[PDB]
C-alpha cells in the first residue's frame, strides 16, 4: 500500500497510524439501507413509537 | 573524480530547504540533524538528553530564507503578468486554470515560489472537455528519461506522483494516489493512469491523446522548470548556500542564549570569606538593595561578574548576518547602513540575477504550456505569457509621466504599451478598452 | 501469475525440493537504489603486454 | 495503534477507569551493496584480432 | 581505421582536478564537505590515523562554513550578461525552429546560450555541435566531455583535423529502470572533407557507423568540421584558463579559516568562571560540586580567591585573516558580494567600468561568434540566407531609461542617425516597452482614435 518513506514533509506526517484492519464501511447504501447510519438526537434513555396492532 | 551534478542526490537538501522555509518549528524538531551535541557522552545519558532540549530551546531562528523568498516574490510579482493573444477566448483558461477557480497568476506564483526555493517545478497539460494546466511538486516527479532519437535530445518517459483525498460517506480520513504515465514511442505521445484504494493499483491501458484537428502529439506536454533552465536534468536549488548560512547562525545562536542564560546574571563573588563570619552576620543571606550595607572581614574583595559583550560567539552572529546581507539576498533591512542612489544601480543587474533567470524560465514554462492547451483546443498558436521582467518597480515621478506621455504623442511606443507603463507604476487600474470606451465620447467641459 | 526462475524461489533439491510462491500487494517488496554506481577501468605496466581491469 | 479507544462507559456511574499510551513502532530499510569481480580486458588481445578495446 | 574512441588528451587530464575543484565549489557546502580531504589539511595526520583523529576531523569540518563566494560572483555576471534577450538579425520565420527548440527539447536557443555562457564563465571552456538528424540541431557539449582535439596545418590554414566528444545519453528500456548509456562522436576531417562516426553502443552492442558525410541542401559535403570550441579566452581548440580558479583559490583558504575559526568559537567561546586559589576541602564544604550563579545566589571564596571568567577575545587574529581574504575576493573586482557600509562615488567608476566588465565583454563576444557560426552551419545545413548573427547583451550595468534618456532616444530618432529598430531595441533594454516592432506599427499605423 502507500508508504510516502521517500518524502518527509512533517514527522511522521500521517504517513501510518494503521489505522484499523476491519472492514466498517457497512452503513446505509453500503448495507443496501440493512444498517442505516443517521444523525437525529433524542432525549432520555429511551426512544418509544406506538402502533397500531 | 565526482559524480554528474550531486548524482541526483538533492533529496535532503529539499528537505532541509522545506524545513528551513517552514519556519522555527521545523527547525526545532530537527536539532539532532542541525545542531550536532556538545558531547557525546551526555547524549548518551538521560541528563544528556534533558540538557540538549534545555540547550536547544533556548535558541533563536533567525528565519532569513523566508523573507529572502518573499522578498523575490514580491519584486518578480508586482501587478499581474502579461498576457499576450486572444484574451477573451482564453479567460476560461486563465480564471479556474484547474477548475478549481485558481487564477492561472496565482499557480504562476506557487510555482515561482517552488522555482525560487528548491529550484524544480513542473507543468503537466492534460485534457480531462476542457484542457488543464496542472502544477507538480518537485518531490512528485520520479523518473525522467533523455534518450535522443533522430539525433536530439529528446525526454521519452516521465512518472509523477499525483495526489487527492477521498470523501468517503464516513469522514474517515482516506489517502489515495494516482500516478500519471507519460512515455515517448516512436516519437508519439501515450499515457496510463493508475488508481490506488489503500493499496489497490487499478491500471489502465495506454491512451493516445490527440489535439483538436487531430494528428496527436509529437512532444511530451509537460516541462519542468528550474531555476537555471527547463531541463529535465536537475538544477541546483538557488538558497544552498543560504540555509547553511542560516543553521550555523542558529547554532552559534543556541550558544549564545545559553551563554546568555547562565553567565549573564551578575554575581556577588565574596572571596575572602569565612563561615563563620557567614553565620555570624551574614546569616545565609546577604541584603544587597542601596538602602542596606553588607559588612566584611578584613581584607575580603567583592566583585561583581558577569560576562560582558563583545564575546567570539556574538562576533561570529554578526559576521555570519553580515554574510547574509553580503550574499545581496534581499532577507533584511539595516537602518544603520545606508547607500547613495545610482551606485546600486551599477549592481541592480547583478543582484537581479536570479529574479530575471527565474522570472524567464517560469514565463517560458507557461508560454509552452499555453501553447500545449490551445493545441488541445484548436485555438491559436501565437500566444505569450511574460511576467514582470523590470524588478524594483515603484511609483513612476510626474516628469516621467511627461516623458511617457511625450512618447506616446511620437510613434515610438504603443497605446497599449504606454497604458501597461502606466499601470505598472501604479498611476492607473482600469483596462485599456474600457478607458477608450469611456474617453471616445465628447469632453465634459 | 508473474512467472520468473529465481533460485531464491526453488528453495529446494532432487526430490525434497519445495517450489515457493508469494502472493503481493501494492509496493510489498520496495528496492531503492542509492544512484552511485562507479566504474574503474585501472592500466598496470611491467607485464608483457599493457592490462586493464575493469 | 491504541488498543482499546471506545469502551462501554455508563453516564449513570463514576468509577475509575485505567489510562493507555502510545507506542511508536520503528519501520527498516536495509542497505545491500554489491559489485563486479576484477575483469581483464587488456587492448593486446582485441587489437590483436582487430576489434576496438 | 581509427585508435580508442576514449583518448584523453594530457591536458584536459591535467585540468581535470581544477575543472572539479572549481565544479564542487560551484556545489556549494555539500561537495566541498563531502570531499574535505582535498582542501582542509588535516591538522595533525598523526591523529588521522587514529579512529578518534577521523571523528575529530568529521566534528571539526562539520562545524565550517561555506561562504561560496564564487556561485555568487557567477550568478552576478550571468545576470549581468544576460540582462533582456540576445537578439537575431536575419529571417526570422524561417529560423524559429532553432529558436524555440535548439535541440529538439523545448529549449529555447536563448537559455542554451545562457548555460554555455554559464560554462564559459566558470570554467572557460564549452562547445557547440551542429549535425543533421528531417531537421538540424544544435548540441551543447561540457568542458570535460570533449575529450580530444587535433590540429593541423594544411595548406598554411589551421584546420580541426579531429575532434572527439563523449555526448552523454540515457536508454529508455522497456521499464523504468535506470540504465546510463553513452555516445561518443569522432569528428575527422580527411583530404578537406568533414567525416563523422557515433559509437552508439545502442544495447550494448557495436553500433559504430561507418564512414559517413552529412551533406549540405545543396550538396558538396562540408570544407569544415561543424563544431566550435568557445572559452573565455577565444574560440581555439586550446584550453583557455579558467576565470574562476582565483575566487576558488580564495574561498577555500576562507573556508579552512572559517573552520578554525568556528572551533576556536565553539570551544573557548562560551564564559568560564576558573575559579582559583582554592582548595578541595572548602570545594566540599561549601560548593559541593554544584555552584549556582543565578542573580539571586550568590556564592563566597576563600582567602587570596580570584575568581576570573574568561572567554576568547573579539578581533582575533582568525577574524583579520577571514577579513583580509573577504576583501581580496571583493578586490579582485568580482560581484561576489556587496558592502552597504561602504560607499563609492558616483561618476568615478565610470572611468573602470571597462576593466571591471572585462570577462564580461570577452565571453560575450566568444559566445556570440560560437552561436553565429552555429547558426551559419545549420543554415547551410538547411541551405538559407548566411548573413546572420546572434549579437549577445554587451552593454553591462543596466538599468532603467531615464526621461532625459528616453527623450534624446527619440530625438536621435527623429533625426536620420538612429534607426526604428534601434531605438525599439534601445526602448526594450530600459524596460519601457515590450510588443514587438512590426506589433507596434502595425497598431499604431492608424490615426488616433481621440
Given at each position: 500500500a502507500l508508504s510516502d518513506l521517500q518524502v518527509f514533509n512533517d514527522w511522521a506526517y500521517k504517513t501510518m497510524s494503521e489505522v484499523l484492519d476491519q472492514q466498517v464501511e457497512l452503513f446505509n447504501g453500503a448495507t443496501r439501507g440493512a444498517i442505516i447510519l443517521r444523525s437525529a438526537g433524542n432525549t432520555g434513555d429511551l426512544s418509544e413509537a406506538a402502533f397500531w396492532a | 573524480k565526482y559524480v554528474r551534478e550531486d548524482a541526483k542526490k538533492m533529496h535532503k537538501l529539499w528537505a532541509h530547504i522545506r524545513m528551513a522555509m517552514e519556519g522555527s518549528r521545523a527547525i526545532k524538531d530537527n536539532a539532532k540533524e542541525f545542531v550536532p551535541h556538545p558531547d557525546?557522552?551526555?547524549?548518551?545519558?538521560?541528563?544528556?538528553?534533558?540538557?540538549?532540549?534545555?540547550?536547544?530551546?533556548?535558541?533563536?531562528?533567525?528565519?532569513?530564507?523566508?523573507?529572502?523568498?518573499?522578498?523575490?516574490?514580491?519584486?518578480?510579482?508586482?501587478?499581474?503578468?502579461?498576457?499576450?493573444?486572444?484574451?477573451?477566448?482564453?479567460?476560461?483558461?486563465?480564471?479556474?486554470?484547474?477548475?478549481?477557480?485558481l487564477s492561472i497568476?496565482?499557480?504562476?506564483?506557487?510555482?515561482?515560489?517552488?522555482?525560487?526555493?528548491?529550484?524544480?517545478?513542473?507543468?503537466?497539460?492534460?485534457?480531462?472537455?476542457?484542457?488543464?494546466?496542472?502544477?507538480?511538486?518537485?518531490?512528485?516527479?520520479?523518473?525522467?528519461?533523455?534518450?535522443?532519437?533522430?539525433?536530439?535530445?529528446?525526454?521519452?518517459?516521465?512518472?509523477?506522483?499525483?495526489?487527492?483525498?477521498?470523501?468517503?460517506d464516513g469522514y474517515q480520513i482516506y489517502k489515495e494516489e494516482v500516478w500519471r504515465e507519460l512515455r515517448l514511442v516512436d516519437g508519439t505521445y501515450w499515457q496510463r493512469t493508475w488508481r490506488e484504494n489503500d493499496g489497490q493499483l487499478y491500471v489502465d491501458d495506454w491512451i493516445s491523446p490527440t489535439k483538436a484537428d487531430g494528428?496527436?502529439?509529437?512532444?511530451?506536454?509537460?516541462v519542468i522548470f528550474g531555476?537555471?533552465?527547463?531541463?529535465?536534468?536537475?538544477?541546483?536549488?538557488?538558497?544552498?548556500?543560504?540555509?547553511?548560512?542560516?543553521?550555523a547562525h542558529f547554532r552559534n545562536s543556541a550558544d549564545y542564549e545559553e551563554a546568555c542564560f547562565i553567565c549573564g546574571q551578575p554575581t556577588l563573588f565574596l572571596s575572602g570569606l569565612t563561615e563563620h563570619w557567614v553565620k555570624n552576620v551574614l546569616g545565609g543571606a546577604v541584603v544587597i538593595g542601596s538602602r542596606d550595607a553588607v559588612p566584611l572581614p578584613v581584607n575580603a574583595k567583592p566583585e561583581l561578574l558577569q560576562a560582558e559583550g563583545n564575546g567570539m560567539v556574538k562576533e561570529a552572529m554578526d559576521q555570519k548576518e553580515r554574510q547574509m546581507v553580503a550574499l545581496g539576498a534581499k532577507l533584511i533591512d539595516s537602518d544603520k547602513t545606508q547607500r547613495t542612489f545610482g551606485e546600486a544601480s551599477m549592481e541592480a543587474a547583478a543582484q537581479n540575477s536570479v529574479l530575471?533567470?527565474?522570472?524567464?524560465?517560469?514565463?517560458?514554462?507557461?508560454?509552452?504550456?499555453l501553447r500545449w492547451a490551445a493545441m488541445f483546443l484548436g485555438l491559436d498558436e501565437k500566444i505569450e505569457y511574460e511576467l514582470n521582467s523590470d524588478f524594483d518597480i515603484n511609483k513612476m515621478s510626474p516628469e516621467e509621466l511627461a516623458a511617457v506621455i511625450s512618447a506616446w504623442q511620437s510613434n515610438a511606443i504603443s497605446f497599449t504599451e504606454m497604458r501597461w507603463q502606466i499601470k505598472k507604476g501604479g498611476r492607473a487600474y482600469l483596462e485599456d478598452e474600457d478607458m477608450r470606451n469611456?474617453?471616445?465620447?465628447?469632453?465634459?467641459? | 501469475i508473474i512467472i520468473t526462475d529465481s533460485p531464491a524461489l526453488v528453495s529446494g533439491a532432487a526430490e525434497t525440493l519445495r517450489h515457493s510462491t508469494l502472493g503481493l500487494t501494492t509496493g510489498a517488496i520496495l528496492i531503492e537504489q542509492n544512484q552511485d554506481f562507479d566504474s574503474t577501468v585501472v592500466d598496470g605496466t611491467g607485464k608483457q603486454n599493457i592490462t586493464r581491469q575493469y | 495503534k491504541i488498543q482499546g479507544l471506545v469502551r462501554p462507559r455508563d453516564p449513570y456511574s463514576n468509577?475509575?477507569?485505567?489510562?493507555?499510551?502510545?507506542?511508536?513502532?520503528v519501520d527498516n530499510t536495509i542497505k545491500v551493496a554489491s559489485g563486479t569481480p576484477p575483469i581483464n580486458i587488456p587492448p593486446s588481445m582485441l587489437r590483436w584480432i582487430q576489434k576496438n578495446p
Open positions: - | 557525546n557522552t551526555k547524549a548518551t545519558t538521560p541528563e544528556g538528553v534533558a540538557r540538549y532540549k534545555a540547550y536547544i530551546e533556548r535558541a533563536v531562528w533567525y528565519g532569513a530564507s523566508a523573507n529572502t523568498v518573499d522578498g523575490m516574490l514580491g519584486q518578480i510579482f508586482a501587478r499581474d503578468p502579461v498576457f499576450t493573444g486572444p484574451e477573451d477566448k482564453f479567460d476560461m483558461l486563465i480564471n479556474d486554470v484547474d477548475g478549481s477557480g497568476h496565482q499557480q504562476a506564483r506557487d510555482s515561482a515560489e517552488d522555482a525560487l526555493s528548491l529550484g524544480r517545478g513542473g507543468l503537466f497539460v492534460d485534457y480531462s472537455a476542457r484542457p488543464y494546466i496542472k502544477f507538480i511538486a518537485a518531490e512528485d516527479i520520479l523518473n525522467w528519461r533523455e534518450r535522443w532519437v533522430n539525433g536530439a535530445k529528446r525526454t521519452t518517459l516521465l512518472v509523477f506522483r499525483e495526489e487527492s483525498d477521498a470523501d468517503d494528428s496527436q502529439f509529437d512532444e511530451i506536454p509537460f531555476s537555471k533552465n527547463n531541463d529535465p536534468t536537475i538544477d541546483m536549488p538557488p538558497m544552498r548556500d543560504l540555509v547553511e548560512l542560516n543553521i530575471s533567470r527565474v522570472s524567464k524560465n517560469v514565463s517560458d514554462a507557461y508560454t509552452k504550456a469611456e474617453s471616445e465620447q465628447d469632453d465634459p467641459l | - | 468509577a475509575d477507569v485505567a489510562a493507555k499510551d502510545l507506542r511508536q513502532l
